[PDB]
Amino acid sequence: LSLSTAVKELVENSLDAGATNIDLKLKDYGVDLIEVSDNGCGVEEENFEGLTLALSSLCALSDVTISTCHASAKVGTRLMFDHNGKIIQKTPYPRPRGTTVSVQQLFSTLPVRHKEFQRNIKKEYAKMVQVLHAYCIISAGIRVSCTNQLGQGKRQPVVCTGGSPSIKENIGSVFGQKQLQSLIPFVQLPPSDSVCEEYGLSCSDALHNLFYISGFISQCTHGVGRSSTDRQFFFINRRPCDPAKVCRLVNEVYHMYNRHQYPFVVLNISVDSECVDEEKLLLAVLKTSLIGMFD
Amino acid sequence: VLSLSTAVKELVENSLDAGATNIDLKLKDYGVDLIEVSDNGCGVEEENFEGLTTFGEALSSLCALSDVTISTCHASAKVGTRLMFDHNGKIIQKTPYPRPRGTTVSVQQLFSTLPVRHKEFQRNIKKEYAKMVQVLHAYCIISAGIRVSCTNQLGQGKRQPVVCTGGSPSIKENIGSVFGQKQLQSLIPFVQLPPSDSVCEEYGLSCSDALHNLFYISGFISQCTHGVGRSSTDRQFFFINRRPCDPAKVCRLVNEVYHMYNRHQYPFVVLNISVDSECVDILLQEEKLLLAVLKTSLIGMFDS
């Protein structure tokens, strides 16, 4: 559990509640406050007790306050929790439909981790930004935002998507239109014979292809790439992940055309549940498709 | 009055009237290139798409002066719609557009069809932009429970934060979001008092004149300490029934009373005057009674 994993869990809870609006509010990069507010279905009053029987772990590590309102409820409710997940306070609370989870002073009950958190805040915040950006990019139709407030300073916007139906416009929201001008869409091709022979694939192995790849990548032109892999986002069935062999292959094929730079990557891999726990076939489709794009 | 601030003011008020709890302003080149307001209010039903078309109503005027694109989705709609308009307000394109409930209005190249006004806009962009920021700050302060955010982008550079509220329930917390917690440390809450006899005699008010008092004033003001005030009136926000305005005599009076204790500085002011809507025309019935309450209350706060 880290700042990034705490944010990942709260974002996923909002997504599962069916939110179209998700606001991440940070104070001191999240050392002081991590707050996720959404307009999802909210929580019914009957299930208030069972919320901490992910959330239970956060209660053990921080001061957690939750406001929620179910559509079947007239008014919302405000809940305070002790570190055993027990409800300290339960009061009516006027708020729109949805849920707000407030994580105050993460790791305060564990002074060693709290200190490592503060000492390493730049790296932990950068990791959290990666998680935030991945969800911003892939969550078409959902407005995702983040703000941060440092010390006595004013609250500052960090990122905000517009609820657009395309990953491309979400990329533009996150990184600006300049980033889009250097990208090409992924174009899927059947795996060629040489690449199949390279991965030891028969004609029968490639005939039952059920991988659907989409997304965007930097053009391989000399100079238009990036200095590092700071903007590489991989998804399997829309969920952010880090596939080693796939990521390895994408960088390898790109360096065949631009050895001194790294590409921007947004790549979603859609596949049937039977193939989830034929990676060779996937890598064959990827290399063949990228070669066709870069030639 | 055609300006950046009034154009932004009307789109923000449109989002507020639609019941938005999130309003995001994206600006490019201080608004010369793009003014885009995105909200999660009720959106627009398809039956009123034709009828969609002070800033000299808002959208119809904006179409004549800019390139207006709107995406919207009403809760009664299955899918959203994206609309492009010509300068007569006629729909160029109407296509299905999956998006969450609410509306996004994009105003591209404001005043481009009026080259003389467009150049004056560009030449005076710093004053036009500062004026708009002041208006935006006023709505940020008073719109408790609503997350308002704004960014500005110059050329291909990164987006720059302008202002951002956190959806807090109090005007006080919005002030902290807009200006930082340091600004709050020098403020005292307004404490309303009945008008004293001397102030009544100063305004020529009888006991009967003040008996029907229906003004309710609240907000914050700088402490009158000789150093904690401000160098100018750059942060003075007045509201009547939560709507930002500039009442001359009230503003004059507030500054006058503060200078009785701090003659060399000007105060930070956030002041809402709550009153029956029948008594408003800025023209305020029984304005003398209001001014007396103000002076009496401010004197009571600053004494100690």
Side-chain angles (χ1 to χ4, degrees), chain A residues 20-21 23 25 35 37 141 143 147 149 152-158 160 163-165 169 173-174, chain B residues 22 24 28 40 97-100 147 150-151 156 159 161-164 166 176-181:
Chain A
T20 61
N21 229 287
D23 304 307
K25 176 191 300 192
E35 169 175 300
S37 176
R143 178 200 162 284
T147 69
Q149 182 176 36
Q152 301 284 78
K154 60 188 290 295
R155 181 153 293 283
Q156 303 198 330
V158 174
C160 186
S164 181
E169 290 171 47
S173 294
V174 172
Chain B
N22 287 83
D24 306 307
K28 293 185 186 186
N40 63 353
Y97 188 78
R99 54 149 295 144
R147 289 171 168 81
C150 179
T151 66
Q156 298 284 255
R159 301 176 314 274
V162 175
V163 73
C164 186
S177 294
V178 172
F179 301 110
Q181 294 293 315

mmCIF file of all heavy atoms in Angstrom, chain A residues 20-21 23 25 35 37 141 143 147 149 152-158 160 163-165 169 173-174 178, chain B residues 22 24 28 40 97-100 147 150-151 156 159 161-164 166 176-182, unseen atoms left out:
data_model
loop_
_atom_site.group_PDB
_atom_site.id
_atom_site.type_symbol
_atom_site.label_atom_id
_atom_site.label_comp_id
_atom_site.label_asym_id
_atom_site.label_seq_id
_atom_site.Cartn_x
_atom_site.Cartn_y
_atom_site.Cartn_z
ATOM 1 N N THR A 20 -19.486 8.963 -13.246
ATOM 2 C CA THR A 20 -19.087 9.709 -14.430
ATOM 3 C C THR A 20 -18.279 10.942 -14.063
ATOM 4 O O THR A 20 -17.828 11.668 -14.955
ATOM 5 C CB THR A 20 -20.311 10.131 -15.246
ATOM 6 O OG1 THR A 20 -21.143 10.977 -14.445
ATOM 7 C CG2 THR A 20 -21.107 8.912 -15.672
ATOM 8 N N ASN A 21 -18.110 11.204 -12.769
ATOM 9 C CA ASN A 21 -17.323 12.319 -12.263
ATOM 10 C C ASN A 21 -16.479 11.790 -11.115
ATOM 11 O O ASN A 21 -17.020 11.226 -10.162
ATOM 12 C CB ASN A 21 -18.237 13.447 -11.779
ATOM 13 C CG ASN A 21 -17.838 14.793 -12.317
ATOM 14 O OD1 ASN A 21 -16.835 15.364 -11.894
ATOM 15 N ND2 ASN A 21 -18.634 15.325 -13.241
ATOM 16 N N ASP A 23 -13.213 13.125 -8.687
ATOM 17 C CA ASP A 23 -12.324 14.218 -8.316
ATOM 18 C C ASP A 23 -11.365 13.733 -7.242
ATOM 19 O O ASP A 23 -11.793 13.277 -6.176
ATOM 20 C CB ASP A 23 -13.112 15.430 -7.818
ATOM 21 C CG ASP A 23 -14.133 15.911 -8.823
ATOM 22 O OD1 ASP A 23 -13.739 16.158 -9.982
ATOM 23 O OD2 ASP A 23 -15.324 16.032 -8.463
ATOM 24 N N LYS A 25 -8.698 15.002 -4.686
ATOM 25 C CA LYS A 25 -8.242 16.200 -3.995
ATOM 26 C C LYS A 25 -7.088 15.828 -3.075
ATOM 27 O O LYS A 25 -7.239 14.979 -2.191
ATOM 28 C CB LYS A 25 -9.383 16.846 -3.212
ATOM 29 C CG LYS A 25 -8.970 18.051 -2.385
ATOM 30 C CD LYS A 25 -10.081 18.462 -1.441
ATOM 31 C CE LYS A 25 -11.331 18.823 -2.216
ATOM 32 N NZ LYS A 25 -12.344 19.488 -1.361
ATOM 33 N N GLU A 35 -8.302 12.596 -1.002
ATOM 34 C CA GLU A 35 -9.758 12.591 -1.025
ATOM 35 C C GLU A 35 -10.271 12.332 -2.430
ATOM 36 O O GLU A 35 -9.900 13.041 -3.370
ATOM 37 C CB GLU A 35 -10.326 13.909 -0.508
ATOM 38 C CG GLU A 35 -11.808 14.046 -0.769
ATOM 39 C CD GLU A 35 -12.394 15.294 -0.159
ATOM 40 O OE1 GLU A 35 -12.309 15.449 1.079
ATOM 41 O OE2 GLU A 35 -12.940 16.121 -0.921
ATOM 42 N N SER A 37 -13.824 12.044 -4.538
ATOM 43 C CA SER A 37 -15.245 12.362 -4.537
ATOM 44 C C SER A 37 -15.834 11.965 -5.886
ATOM 45 O O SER A 37 -15.265 12.293 -6.932
ATOM 46 C CB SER A 37 -15.460 13.851 -4.259
ATOM 47 O OG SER A 37 -16.831 14.203 -4.348
ATOM 48 N N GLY A 141 -15.765 8.861 -21.397
ATOM 49 C CA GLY A 141 -17.082 9.129 -20.858
ATOM 50 C C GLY A 141 -17.118 9.510 -19.397
ATOM 51 O O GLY A 141 -18.212 9.709 -18.851
ATOM 52 N N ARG A 143 -15.455 12.077 -16.351
ATOM 53 C CA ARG A 143 -14.679 13.268 -16.043
ATOM 54 C C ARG A 143 -13.824 12.963 -14.818
ATOM 55 O O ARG A 143 -14.349 12.773 -13.719
ATOM 56 C CB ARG A 143 -15.604 14.458 -15.802
ATOM 57 C CG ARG A 143 -14.876 15.724 -15.427
ATOM 58 C CD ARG A 143 -15.799 16.712 -14.739
ATOM 59 N NE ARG A 143 -15.038 17.719 -14.010
ATOM 60 C CZ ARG A 143 -14.437 17.501 -12.848
ATOM 61 N NH1 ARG A 143 -14.478 16.314 -12.260
ATOM 62 N NH2 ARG A 143 -13.773 18.494 -12.265
ATOM 63 N N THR A 147 -6.670 17.858 -8.048
ATOM 64 C CA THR A 147 -6.157 19.133 -7.578
ATOM 65 C C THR A 147 -5.207 18.870 -6.424
ATOM 66 O O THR A 147 -5.262 17.822 -5.775
ATOM 67 C CB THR A 147 -7.277 20.072 -7.118
ATOM 68 O OG1 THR A 147 -7.862 19.562 -5.913
ATOM 69 C CG2 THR A 147 -8.353 20.151 -8.185
ATOM 70 N N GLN A 149 -2.940 21.047 -3.120
ATOM 71 C CA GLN A 149 -2.762 22.258 -2.327
ATOM 72 C C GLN A 149 -1.558 22.047 -1.416
ATOM 73 O O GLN A 149 -1.511 21.061 -0.676
ATOM 74 C CB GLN A 149 -4.038 22.572 -1.533
ATOM 75 C CG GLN A 149 -4.005 23.847 -0.700
ATOM 76 C CD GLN A 149 -5.343 24.129 -0.031
ATOM 77 O OE1 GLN A 149 -6.041 23.211 0.398
ATOM 78 N NE2 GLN A 149 -5.717 25.405 0.037
ATOM 79 N N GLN A 152 0.294 26.561 2.998
ATOM 80 C CA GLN A 152 -0.618 27.687 3.117
ATOM 81 C C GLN A 152 -1.067 28.220 1.765
ATOM 82 O O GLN A 152 -1.796 29.218 1.721
ATOM 83 C CB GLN A 152 0.065 28.824 3.889
ATOM 84 C CG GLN A 152 0.519 28.477 5.297
ATOM 85 C CD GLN A 152 -0.618 28.421 6.298
ATOM 86 O OE1 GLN A 152 -1.373 27.449 6.348
ATOM 87 N NE2 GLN A 152 -0.738 29.465 7.114
ATOM 88 N N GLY A 153 -0.655 27.575 0.665
ATOM 89 C CA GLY A 153 -0.943 28.066 -0.665
ATOM 90 C C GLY A 153 -2.363 27.811 -1.129
ATOM 91 O O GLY A 153 -3.162 27.149 -0.472
ATOM 92 N N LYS A 154 -2.660 28.361 -2.303
ATOM 93 C CA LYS A 154 -3.960 28.216 -2.936
ATOM 94 C C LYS A 154 -4.087 26.848 -3.596
ATOM 95 O O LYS A 154 -3.094 26.228 -3.983
ATOM 96 C CB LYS A 154 -4.161 29.336 -3.959
ATOM 97 C CG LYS A 154 -3.126 29.353 -5.068
ATOM 98 C CD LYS A 154 -3.254 30.599 -5.948
ATOM 99 C CE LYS A 154 -4.505 30.595 -6.822
ATOM 100 N NZ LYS A 154 -4.472 29.500 -7.836
ATOM 101 N N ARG A 155 -5.324 26.370 -3.708
ATOM 102 C CA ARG A 155 -5.572 25.115 -4.407
ATOM 103 C C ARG A 155 -5.306 25.275 -5.900
ATOM 104 O O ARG A 155 -5.706 26.265 -6.519
ATOM 105 C CB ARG A 155 -7.007 24.646 -4.166
ATOM 106 C CG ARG A 155 -7.342 23.326 -4.835
ATOM 107 C CD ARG A 155 -8.449 22.573 -4.112
ATOM 108 N NE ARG A 155 -8.030 22.114 -2.791
ATOM 109 C CZ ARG A 155 -7.245 21.067 -2.564
ATOM 110 N NH1 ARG A 155 -6.762 20.328 -3.556
ATOM 111 N NH2 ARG A 155 -6.943 20.745 -1.311
ATOM 112 N N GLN A 156 -4.606 24.302 -6.480
ATOM 113 C CA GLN A 156 -4.230 24.377 -7.879
ATOM 114 C C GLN A 156 -4.720 23.162 -8.656
ATOM 115 O O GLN A 156 -4.561 22.024 -8.191
ATOM 116 C CB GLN A 156 -2.709 24.524 -8.009
ATOM 117 C CG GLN A 156 -2.211 25.750 -7.252
ATOM 118 C CD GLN A 156 -0.838 26.200 -7.669
ATOM 119 O OE1 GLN A 156 -0.011 25.397 -8.086
ATOM 120 N NE2 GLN A 156 -0.585 27.499 -7.561
ATOM 121 N N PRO A 157 -5.324 23.358 -9.827
ATOM 122 C CA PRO A 157 -5.711 22.212 -10.657
ATOM 123 C C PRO A 157 -4.483 21.478 -11.172
ATOM 124 O O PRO A 157 -3.447 22.081 -11.462
ATOM 125 C CB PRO A 157 -6.520 22.846 -11.795
ATOM 126 C CG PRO A 157 -6.157 24.282 -11.788
ATOM 127 C CD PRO A 157 -5.785 24.638 -10.386
ATOM 128 N N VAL A 158 -4.598 20.157 -11.246
ATOM 129 C CA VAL A 158 -3.530 19.289 -11.722
ATOM 130 C C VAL A 158 -3.868 18.691 -13.083
ATOM 131 O O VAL A 158 -3.066 18.760 -14.014
ATOM 132 C CB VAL A 158 -3.212 18.184 -10.690
ATOM 133 C CG1 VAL A 158 -2.194 17.209 -11.259
ATOM 134 C CG2 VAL A 158 -2.695 18.803 -9.399
ATOM 135 N N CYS A 160 -7.639 17.442 -15.616
ATOM 136 C CA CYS A 160 -9.094 17.373 -15.713
ATOM 137 C C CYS A 160 -9.457 16.918 -17.115
ATOM 138 O O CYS A 160 -9.102 17.585 -18.090
ATOM 139 C CB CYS A 160 -9.727 18.726 -15.407
ATOM 140 S SG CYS A 160 -11.520 18.675 -15.334
ATOM 141 N N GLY A 163 -14.819 14.249 -20.056
ATOM 142 C CA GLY A 163 -15.831 13.244 -20.314
ATOM 143 C C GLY A 163 -15.949 12.880 -21.775
ATOM 144 O O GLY A 163 -17.048 12.585 -22.246
ATOM 145 N N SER A 164 -14.837 12.888 -22.506
ATOM 146 C CA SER A 164 -14.871 12.679 -23.942
ATOM 147 C C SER A 164 -14.946 11.189 -24.269
ATOM 148 O O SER A 164 -14.432 10.354 -23.521
ATOM 149 C CB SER A 164 -13.630 13.283 -24.592
ATOM 150 O OG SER A 164 -13.645 13.105 -25.996
ATOM 151 N N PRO A 165 -15.587 10.831 -25.386
ATOM 152 C CA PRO A 165 -15.716 9.411 -25.738
ATOM 153 C C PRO A 165 -14.479 8.802 -26.379
ATOM 154 O O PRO A 165 -14.460 7.581 -26.590
ATOM 155 C CB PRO A 165 -16.902 9.400 -26.714
ATOM 156 C CG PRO A 165 -16.898 10.755 -27.321
ATOM 157 C CD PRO A 165 -16.407 11.695 -26.254
ATOM 158 N N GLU A 169 -8.864 12.279 -27.417
ATOM 159 C CA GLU A 169 -9.167 13.545 -26.761
ATOM 160 C C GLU A 169 -8.792 13.508 -25.284
ATOM 161 O O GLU A 169 -8.383 14.533 -24.724
ATOM 162 C CB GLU A 169 -10.641 13.897 -26.961
ATOM 163 C CG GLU A 169 -10.955 14.284 -28.406
ATOM 164 C CD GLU A 169 -12.439 14.432 -28.688
ATOM 165 O OE1 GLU A 169 -13.140 15.092 -27.892
ATOM 166 O OE2 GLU A 169 -12.902 13.901 -29.723
ATOM 167 N N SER A 173 -6.465 16.056 -23.357
ATOM 168 C CA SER A 173 -6.783 16.687 -22.079
ATOM 169 C C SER A 173 -5.629 16.545 -21.099
ATOM 170 O O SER A 173 -5.303 17.486 -20.366
ATOM 171 C CB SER A 173 -8.053 16.077 -21.486
ATOM 172 O OG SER A 173 -9.183 16.371 -22.283
ATOM 173 N N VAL A 174 -4.995 15.376 -21.079
ATOM 174 C CA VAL A 174 -3.963 15.102 -20.091
ATOM 175 C C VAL A 174 -2.665 15.815 -20.445
ATOM 176 O O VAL A 174 -2.052 16.472 -19.598
ATOM 177 C CB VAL A 174 -3.756 13.583 -19.958
ATOM 178 C CG1 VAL A 174 -2.560 13.288 -19.082
ATOM 179 C CG2 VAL A 174 -5.003 12.930 -19.396
ATOM 180 N N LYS A 178 -0.179 19.393 -28.326
ATOM 181 C CA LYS A 178 1.142 19.190 -28.908
ATOM 182 C C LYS A 178 1.537 17.721 -28.870
ATOM 183 O O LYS A 178 2.160 17.212 -29.808
ATOM 184 C CB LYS A 178 2.179 20.047 -28.177
ATOM 185 C CG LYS A 178 3.576 19.997 -28.789
ATOM 186 C CD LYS A 178 4.607 20.667 -27.894
ATOM 187 N N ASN B 22 -19.807 20.745 -10.727
ATOM 188 C CA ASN B 22 -18.445 20.832 -11.231
ATOM 189 C C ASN B 22 -18.469 21.731 -12.455
ATOM 190 O O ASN B 22 -19.260 21.500 -13.372
ATOM 191 C CB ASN B 22 -17.881 19.455 -11.602
ATOM 192 C CG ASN B 22 -17.559 18.607 -10.392
ATOM 193 O OD1 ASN B 22 -18.435 17.959 -9.818
ATOM 194 N ND2 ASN B 22 -16.292 18.598 -10.000
ATOM 195 N N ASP B 24 -15.581 23.501 -15.039
ATOM 196 C CA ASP B 24 -14.169 23.553 -15.397
ATOM 197 C C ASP B 24 -13.979 24.538 -16.541
ATOM 198 O O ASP B 24 -14.600 24.389 -17.598
ATOM 199 C CB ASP B 24 -13.671 22.161 -15.778
ATOM 200 C CG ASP B 24 -13.958 21.139 -14.699
ATOM 201 O OD1 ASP B 24 -13.568 21.386 -13.539
ATOM 202 O OD2 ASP B 24 -14.600 20.108 -14.997
ATOM 203 N N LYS B 28 -7.189 29.340 -23.410
ATOM 204 C CA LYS B 28 -5.981 29.348 -24.224
ATOM 205 C C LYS B 28 -5.672 30.772 -24.663
ATOM 206 O O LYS B 28 -6.543 31.460 -25.207
ATOM 207 C CB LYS B 28 -6.121 28.421 -25.439
ATOM 208 C CG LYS B 28 -6.211 26.945 -25.080
ATOM 209 C CD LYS B 28 -6.218 26.080 -26.322
ATOM 210 C CE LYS B 28 -6.444 24.619 -25.979
ATOM 211 N NZ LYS B 28 -6.300 23.754 -27.187
ATOM 212 N N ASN B 40 -21.314 19.696 -15.272
ATOM 213 C CA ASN B 40 -22.102 18.479 -15.104
ATOM 214 C C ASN B 40 -23.528 18.803 -14.657
ATOM 215 O O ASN B 40 -24.133 18.079 -13.865
ATOM 216 C CB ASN B 40 -21.405 17.516 -14.139
ATOM 217 C CG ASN B 40 -21.270 18.074 -12.732
ATOM 218 O OD1 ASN B 40 -21.582 19.233 -12.476
ATOM 219 N ND2 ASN B 40 -20.776 17.247 -11.813
ATOM 220 N N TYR B 97 -23.035 11.902 -29.665
ATOM 221 C CA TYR B 97 -21.764 12.114 -28.977
ATOM 222 C C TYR B 97 -21.900 11.554 -27.573
ATOM 223 O O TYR B 97 -22.468 12.208 -26.686
ATOM 224 C CB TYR B 97 -21.425 13.601 -28.952
ATOM 225 C CG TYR B 97 -20.053 13.958 -28.447
ATOM 226 C CD1 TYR B 97 -18.936 13.803 -29.256
ATOM 227 C CD2 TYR B 97 -19.878 14.498 -27.180
ATOM 228 C CE1 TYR B 97 -17.678 14.147 -28.808
ATOM 229 C CE2 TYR B 97 -18.624 14.848 -26.723
ATOM 230 C CZ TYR B 97 -17.525 14.670 -27.542
ATOM 231 O OH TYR B 97 -16.269 15.014 -27.095
ATOM 232 N N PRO B 98 -21.378 10.353 -27.319
ATOM 233 C CA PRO B 98 -21.500 9.769 -25.975
ATOM 234 C C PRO B 98 -20.653 10.554 -24.984
ATOM 235 O O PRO B 98 -19.435 10.661 -25.135
ATOM 236 C CB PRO B 98 -20.988 8.334 -26.158
ATOM 237 C CG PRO B 98 -21.056 8.086 -27.625
ATOM 238 C CD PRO B 98 -20.789 9.404 -28.275
ATOM 239 N N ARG B 99 -21.307 11.093 -23.963
ATOM 240 C CA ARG B 99 -20.664 11.928 -22.962
ATOM 241 C C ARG B 99 -21.539 11.920 -21.722
ATOM 242 O O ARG B 99 -22.734 11.616 -21.811
ATOM 243 C CB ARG B 99 -20.465 13.364 -23.477
ATOM 244 C CG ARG B 99 -21.739 14.035 -23.979
ATOM 245 C CD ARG B 99 -21.678 15.530 -23.757
ATOM 246 N NE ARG B 99 -21.648 15.824 -22.332
ATOM 247 C CZ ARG B 99 -20.956 16.809 -21.779
ATOM 248 N NH1 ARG B 99 -20.220 17.632 -22.508
ATOM 249 N NH2 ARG B 99 -20.981 16.954 -20.458
ATOM 250 N N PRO B 100 -20.979 12.227 -20.553
ATOM 251 C CA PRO B 100 -21.805 12.286 -19.344
ATOM 252 C C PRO B 100 -22.773 13.459 -19.380
ATOM 253 O O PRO B 100 -22.640 14.394 -20.172
ATOM 254 C CB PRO B 100 -20.779 12.444 -18.216
ATOM 255 C CG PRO B 100 -19.579 13.017 -18.871
ATOM 256 C CD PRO B 100 -19.552 12.439 -20.253
ATOM 257 N N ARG B 147 -17.389 22.766 -7.229
ATOM 258 C CA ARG B 147 -15.976 22.765 -7.582
ATOM 259 C C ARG B 147 -15.816 23.568 -8.862
ATOM 260 O O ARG B 147 -16.314 23.169 -9.918
ATOM 261 C CB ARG B 147 -15.456 21.341 -7.764
ATOM 262 C CG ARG B 147 -15.337 20.541 -6.485
ATOM 263 C CD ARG B 147 -15.017 19.080 -6.781
ATOM 264 N NE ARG B 147 -14.628 18.346 -5.581
ATOM 265 C CZ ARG B 147 -15.481 17.847 -4.698
ATOM 266 N NH1 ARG B 147 -16.789 17.973 -4.854
ATOM 267 N NH2 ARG B 147 -15.011 17.209 -3.629
ATOM 268 N N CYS B 150 -10.056 26.530 -13.093
ATOM 269 C CA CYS B 150 -9.701 27.274 -14.289
ATOM 270 C C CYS B 150 -8.217 27.120 -14.564
ATOM 271 O O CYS B 150 -7.397 27.185 -13.646
ATOM 272 C CB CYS B 150 -10.059 28.755 -14.148
ATOM 273 S SG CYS B 150 -9.631 29.747 -15.588
ATOM 274 N N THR B 151 -7.882 26.903 -15.829
ATOM 275 C CA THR B 151 -6.502 26.890 -16.284
ATOM 276 C C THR B 151 -6.371 27.783 -17.507
ATOM 277 O O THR B 151 -7.353 28.101 -18.184
ATOM 278 C CB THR B 151 -5.996 25.475 -16.625
ATOM 279 O OG1 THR B 151 -6.700 24.964 -17.767
ATOM 280 C CG2 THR B 151 -6.161 24.533 -15.449
ATOM 281 N N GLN B 156 2.045 26.494 -27.000
ATOM 282 C CA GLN B 156 2.199 25.064 -26.776
ATOM 283 C C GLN B 156 2.663 24.735 -25.363
ATOM 284 O O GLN B 156 2.981 23.574 -25.083
ATOM 285 C CB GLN B 156 3.162 24.464 -27.805
ATOM 286 C CG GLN B 156 2.691 24.583 -29.255
ATOM 287 C CD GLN B 156 1.593 23.589 -29.610
ATOM 288 O OE1 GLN B 156 1.840 22.595 -30.295
ATOM 289 N NE2 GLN B 156 0.374 23.859 -29.156
ATOM 290 N N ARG B 159 -0.436 23.837 -19.309
ATOM 291 C CA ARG B 159 -1.547 24.541 -18.694
ATOM 292 C C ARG B 159 -1.111 25.100 -17.349
ATOM 293 O O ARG B 159 -0.377 24.454 -16.597
ATOM 294 C CB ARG B 159 -2.743 23.609 -18.508
ATOM 295 C CG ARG B 159 -3.268 22.988 -19.787
ATOM 296 C CD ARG B 159 -4.383 22.004 -19.477
ATOM 297 N NE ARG B 159 -4.013 21.128 -18.371
ATOM 298 C CZ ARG B 159 -3.330 19.998 -18.502
ATOM 299 N NH1 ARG B 159 -2.932 19.563 -19.688
ATOM 300 N NH2 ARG B 159 -3.036 19.289 -17.415
ATOM 301 N N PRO B 161 -2.252 26.822 -13.633
ATOM 302 C CA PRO B 161 -3.398 26.975 -12.731
ATOM 303 C C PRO B 161 -3.770 28.436 -12.565
ATOM 304 O O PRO B 161 -2.908 29.309 -12.448
ATOM 305 C CB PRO B 161 -2.899 26.381 -11.409
ATOM 306 C CG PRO B 161 -1.425 26.407 -11.500
ATOM 307 C CD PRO B 161 -1.066 26.287 -12.947
ATOM 308 N N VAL B 162 -5.066 28.701 -12.556
ATOM 309 C CA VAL B 162 -5.589 30.040 -12.337
ATOM 310 C C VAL B 162 -6.330 30.128 -11.009
ATOM 311 O O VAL B 162 -6.005 30.960 -10.162
ATOM 312 C CB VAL B 162 -6.493 30.482 -13.510
ATOM 313 C CG1 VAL B 162 -7.133 31.835 -13.213
ATOM 314 C CG2 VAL B 162 -5.696 30.538 -14.805
ATOM 315 N N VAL B 163 -7.316 29.253 -10.802
ATOM 316 C CA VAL B 163 -8.073 29.207 -9.554
ATOM 317 C C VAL B 163 -8.725 27.835 -9.462
ATOM 318 O O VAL B 163 -8.936 27.160 -10.471
ATOM 319 C CB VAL B 163 -9.122 30.347 -9.480
ATOM 320 C CG1 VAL B 163 -10.292 30.066 -10.406
ATOM 321 C CG2 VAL B 163 -9.605 30.547 -8.047
ATOM 322 N N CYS B 164 -9.044 27.415 -8.243
ATOM 323 C CA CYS B 164 -9.631 26.096 -8.040
ATOM 324 C C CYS B 164 -10.266 26.034 -6.661
ATOM 325 O O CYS B 164 -9.586 26.281 -5.660
ATOM 326 C CB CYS B 164 -8.564 25.027 -8.190
ATOM 327 S SG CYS B 164 -9.212 23.391 -8.120
ATOM 328 N N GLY B 166 -12.605 23.553 -3.898
ATOM 329 C CA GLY B 166 -12.665 22.159 -3.514
ATOM 330 C C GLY B 166 -14.040 21.590 -3.246
ATOM 331 O O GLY B 166 -14.135 20.482 -2.705
ATOM 332 N N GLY B 176 -10.053 30.253 1.336
ATOM 333 C CA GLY B 176 -8.779 29.566 1.477
ATOM 334 C C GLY B 176 -8.338 28.884 0.196
ATOM 335 O O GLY B 176 -7.161 28.923 -0.162
ATOM 336 N N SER B 177 -9.275 28.255 -0.516
ATOM 337 C CA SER B 177 -8.928 27.626 -1.790
ATOM 338 C C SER B 177 -8.465 28.653 -2.817
ATOM 339 O O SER B 177 -7.491 28.422 -3.543
ATOM 340 C CB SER B 177 -10.120 26.836 -2.327
ATOM 341 O OG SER B 177 -10.432 25.741 -1.489
ATOM 342 N N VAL B 178 -9.140 29.802 -2.880
ATOM 343 C CA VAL B 178 -8.860 30.779 -3.928
ATOM 344 C C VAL B 178 -7.550 31.507 -3.653
ATOM 345 O O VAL B 178 -6.729 31.694 -4.557
ATOM 346 C CB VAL B 178 -10.044 31.756 -4.072
ATOM 347 C CG1 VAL B 178 -9.693 32.895 -5.015
ATOM 348 C CG2 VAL B 178 -11.278 31.031 -4.580
ATOM 349 N N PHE B 179 -7.331 31.932 -2.408
ATOM 350 C CA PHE B 179 -6.197 32.784 -2.069
ATOM 351 C C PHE B 179 -5.171 32.144 -1.143
ATOM 352 O O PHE B 179 -4.126 32.754 -0.904
ATOM 353 C CB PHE B 179 -6.686 34.088 -1.418
ATOM 354 C CG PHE B 179 -7.610 34.899 -2.286
ATOM 355 C CD1 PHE B 179 -8.954 35.009 -1.974
ATOM 356 C CD2 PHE B 179 -7.130 35.560 -3.407
ATOM 357 C CE1 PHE B 179 -9.801 35.757 -2.762
ATOM 358 C CE2 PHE B 179 -7.970 36.311 -4.199
ATOM 359 C CZ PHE B 179 -9.309 36.408 -3.875
ATOM 360 N N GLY B 180 -5.425 30.953 -0.618
ATOM 361 C CA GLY B 180 -4.513 30.322 0.312
ATOM 362 C C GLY B 180 -4.921 30.553 1.760
ATOM 363 O O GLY B 180 -5.691 31.460 2.088
ATOM 364 N N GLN B 181 -4.388 29.707 2.645
ATOM 365 C CA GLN B 181 -4.720 29.817 4.062
ATOM 366 C C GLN B 181 -4.137 31.068 4.695
ATOM 367 O O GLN B 181 -4.663 31.535 5.710
ATOM 368 C CB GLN B 181 -4.240 28.584 4.833
ATOM 369 C CG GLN B 181 -4.952 27.300 4.466
ATOM 370 C CD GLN B 181 -6.409 27.321 4.869
ATOM 371 O OE1 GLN B 181 -6.754 27.737 5.976
ATOM 372 N NE2 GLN B 181 -7.276 26.873 3.971
ATOM 373 N N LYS B 182 -3.067 31.618 4.119
ATOM 374 C CA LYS B 182 -2.484 32.837 4.665
ATOM 375 C C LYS B 182 -3.486 33.986 4.642
ATOM 376 O O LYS B 182 -3.543 34.789 5.580
ATOM 377 C CB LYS B 182 -1.222 33.206 3.885
#
